């Protein structure tokens, strides 16, 4: 842990990217977190919402 500053910087960056990827998999108050299933499980007008 002598180079702890650089390790902290890369860990913060990795945590930010991992958080972004995890947020990508989010319901966000919809029916599902995947959009292809929304397209296949709804007609285009309802799906737009």
């Amino acid at each position: 842990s002598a180079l702890g500053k650089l390790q902290d910087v890369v860990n913060q960056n990795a945590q930010a990217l991992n958080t972004l990827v995890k947020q990508l998999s989010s319901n966000f108050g919809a029916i599902s977190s995947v959009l292809n299933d929304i397209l296949s499980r709804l007609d285009p007008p309802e799906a737009e919402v």
């Binding site: 029916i31 296949s40 499980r41 709804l42 007609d43 309802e46």
Partner: protein, 50 residues
């Protein structure tokens, strides 16, 4: 069946042809919730309950 004794059948391990239901049109109400009502309900389902 009567309303209180609602009868449940499990549709398992068979392919389904949902399009006869859609094109029959004799069905008075064909309202679909959560699944598409534009004849796009032809998807892989683990369990189908009638």
């Amino acid at each position: 069946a009567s309303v209180y004794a609602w009868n449940r059948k499990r549709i398992s391990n068979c392919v389904a042809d949902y399009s006869v239901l859609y094109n029959s049109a004799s069905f008075s109400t064909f309202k679909c919730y959560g699944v598409s009502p534009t004849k796009l309900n032809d998807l892989c389902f683990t369990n189908v309950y009638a």
